[model samples]
Target: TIEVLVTVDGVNFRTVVLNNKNTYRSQLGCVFFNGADISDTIPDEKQNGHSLYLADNLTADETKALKELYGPVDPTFLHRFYSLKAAVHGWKMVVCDKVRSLKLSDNNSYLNAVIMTLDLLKDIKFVIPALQHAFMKHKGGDSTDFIALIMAYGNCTFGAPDDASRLLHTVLAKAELCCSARMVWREWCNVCGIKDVVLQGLKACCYVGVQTVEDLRARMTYVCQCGGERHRQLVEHTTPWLLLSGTPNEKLVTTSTAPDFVAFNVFQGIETAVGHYVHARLKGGLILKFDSGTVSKTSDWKCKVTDVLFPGQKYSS
Candidate 1:
């Protein structure tokens, strides 16, 4: 065995020739070898070479202690590291390379598989380039767009609802503005007698109604040229605009009545009427069972409600 005393950052270390090949053992259980072949003669500078490896400024004892703590370093360590490295490289070639070619319908599946594969890797530094490339390729309206956005930001997972809600609100606000603009544009075309040209160029637009329950139920109308037969026909053919509302507080009611069988019969009738009203208006087609409980200090009412609502689902809070 040929031995060489190596000095790195003013600290002395050692390198040795195994089977006539010069190799350097790193402190972190990694071994590095000379770029040249075993039979190739060592360079002039290496003939009296004090330093064969660039060890990251660790002292002689510190390097040896690290090696001791880690145990013996060999070709196996390099083999495993390179294998992991190759796997990441292979993923880029097989998956990330085809991201741009994938159809819109297939984008989500491909992107999701790539993301899951990346999650398994220990060193992700080499994988970032491929991830960024895929992210840029799949930016659009589908769920894959959201996944791409998350990956672009270097997030391993999607953000919480609260974190994403602000962006959703802004997008909805912009959509509302666009709806208003289109309504005005259609009205202008109708008034100008250029409605024929506008209809040819654009799809039939429906008026978006943002109204309270009372306003909607009262048969209130906004009289405009665009609210005629054509608009009515278009609205009926296409999907209706969504009607959003704030939560309503229940009204408190009281009644005075005589006791005994007659009063009990009346109470039962009232309960049945209330249940029918709730089933028709509030519950819609879904069945909801109301859970009543005392407001005890130690009780977790939300957890109990969660248990009832989603029996098998996990509750965090």
Candidate 2:
């Protein structure tokens, strides 16, 4: 058996043992990368769509002030103060706080799964739609371009047995009013100072699901530099991953086990707070491994972490 130690900020968080299914466990984990110097650029884009790549810490006084001013709006109101404080903010803050209390996995796999779950909530809930809206408004009502924009940064899922078409459709349906986004290939090529370099860049581009606004912006900027239809394809491929809607289609897969609805709903609330970074990461890139042994032990049992693949790395389907 292999033993692993768990730590946060260099302190021992816990320890665990691993094995095959008989005594094996499953888990989930989340890594939040706050880009360098992110803390200094605060209060820049509070409520607008252009403020995706940003982060800052909030003092106790700041949190109280924002709560007092915005609390009357909605307990779940997604104010900037809340956004700066926790992974999920505002209206969903309470729920995300609850999700943090979810039973931990005995194995490492569950930790990876939960982290992926966080990614999906972030993408589907806030970031993608925010980008989609920005492009659509800029493009001035071109349906093809609007879809192209949504395809570029929209939403997605990963690791579930079935494809997330239903969820994708739900988000697009809402975003249709904000459609008409354009792809600016020549502008990118000119900026990079390489003619048609944009197309090559697009071919090598990578899509990722990240937790923070800064991450969301960085990933999107990378994709944009790689101009071409592949960029469009990348965005289109992720559309289905973004939607969160009705019952997941069972016919889409050979198995019929439902996902943990409690986790899913909890994630939905988190998205409302932090934006859609959570959903995008979970749907498009991360993997989820269930613990059959745990399920066998308790009707409502969930698993723990075994491994996690970071965002932007190549992964096998």
Candidate 3:
């Protein structure tokens, strides 16, 4: 019999020994997830299906306690958790796909951290590429060492679990790619190899948006044609629209139901209003200019944003 012990952060949670067809065949099925810190001991037979068997039934008071803590286990959260799991699983499945199609080695050398990020980013059920690009730009590039990746991107807002960070890493490592750089780059190429382009585009878009708002705020001073004190009150109207500020904790502005925390909008006016098109064009041109003009110049231009001069980062047209 072969014994497999599962641990989290080096803490042993459970051990299972395989002896027969079911346990022996489903050996790869065992996964160490980031749920409840660690799940209680799971017996060998419990590993037969997608879910482990519950040996003890909950008493009336125990049921109430369970409800109080977990709120009856919403299918939404379960769906989310399982969907995320399946998506990551599907990424690993690609290895078999490649092995069969390309007739490659079973050594499973293609899976890595960059590939995992790319896989998760491409998963329509998990995240949109545009959203991934935007988020990575805001948070910086991919630093997928497991814990950092969770804190950086994965969360309830994206329909992932609360402590999803732990489970995500476990799932990735189990996929047999070990979350390495080569694997990540291979999957990332499904979109474009230009990880830096996506990152820079996000930064450029944000910088241009903020600068445009500031420009409009400065222009508000010119609106006061009248010399009366009441004319100064017009600036107050514009000030609130432009005075956007945010921290990781607090919302910068609030509306009826939604709180705009990391992002806020400034209305330049009815005639000079900023909308999606202008934002897109400005960002696109900025990327083109930065890539062609500056990024192409230096070998290490990808190293730092300051290494290149992005005019749009400072001013908006």
Candidate 4:
């Protein structure tokens, strides 16, 4: 119930999109994002799928622990963390999404640090202006490297675990800050091949009430208050939309749920459609000589084993 972001007005704009509108002017005709009109607290860091806050089972102590941790973040704290080395908190902070599962391990500090900063670093609001601040503020040959590495950081070693790792090892790809990041672009990508994949996927999750362009213009188009023919703005951009979610255009955004996080397989061969086992590729990657389809303890008892594909490291077979 305490969720935020995805509510800032991008339909019209004047203020900043990061850290609460930073006072501004714009070409979209300078409108206000009344997020201030109602609520005073919101948004999150890293904005990850699996998180400490997301854990269903938690003590009130840990809940309040995070209250002080995230409620009021200091801007200087962000600068200082970036000023230091990744070792003290560099990559150590990067790989801790799964660190929550290690509630009893050494990953606590790492998880805490990353959970605090990554969301701030992710500018889910702008492009050029967003990254420009980083490069300009730090000003160095190293600043570029530091910021770039942060965006691309992936040492999933201690990253969110148990079922989380099971997800990575399976078909689900790694998490990404940018929706259109190379990791997820292959699936929800715009421009070029299979661009409508996401649109099609949403179709199943959403209901539609159709409209006709000409009739829509006649009935809904505004002729303007003595201005020109009322500026017509038909948004035709996709990746860009996936790029910044000023608001979840997805009407019932919260209704969507997490997937089971498992992998699917298929069979293929020259004559596989009507061929014998010798002609078919029945097994999935990351596997070996096994007789039974599902394995457990003491059933039919015809078995052998191999640790492989789904590659052990996304490893080579």
User: Which one wins on lDDT?
Assistant: 2
Q: Write the per-residue lDDT of candidate 1 for residues 121-206, one digit (tens) a residue.
A: 22112223322333334333122432433332322222211122122222222121112111112222344342312221012121
Candidate 1 residue runs with Cα over 4 Å from true position: 1-142, 147-166, 173-212, 215-239, 245-284, 287-317
Q: What RMSD does each model have against the real structure?
A: 22.8, 22.6, 19.5, 22.6
Instruction: Using TM-score, rank the candidates from best to worst.
Output: 3, 2, 1, 4
Candidate 4 lDDT over 215-280, as tens digits, reads: 111323334444423333222222211111011111111102321111111111222132101000
Query: Which residue pairs collide, candidate 1?
Result: none
Where's the lowest-lDDT run of ten residues in candidate 2?
A: 88-97
lDDT for position 269 in model 4: 23
**Over 4 Å off, model 3:** 23-142, 146-209, 216-295, 298-317
In candidate 4, stretches whose alpha carbon ends up further than 4 angstroms from where it belongs are 1-229, 235-241, 247-317
lDDT of 4: 0.22
* Pick by TM-score: 1 or 2, better one: 2
Better of 3 and 4 by TM-score: 3
TM-score attained by model 1: 0.18
Q: What's the C-alpha lDDT at position 47 in model 1?
A: 37
Whole-model lDDT for model 3 versus the true structure? Answer: 0.25
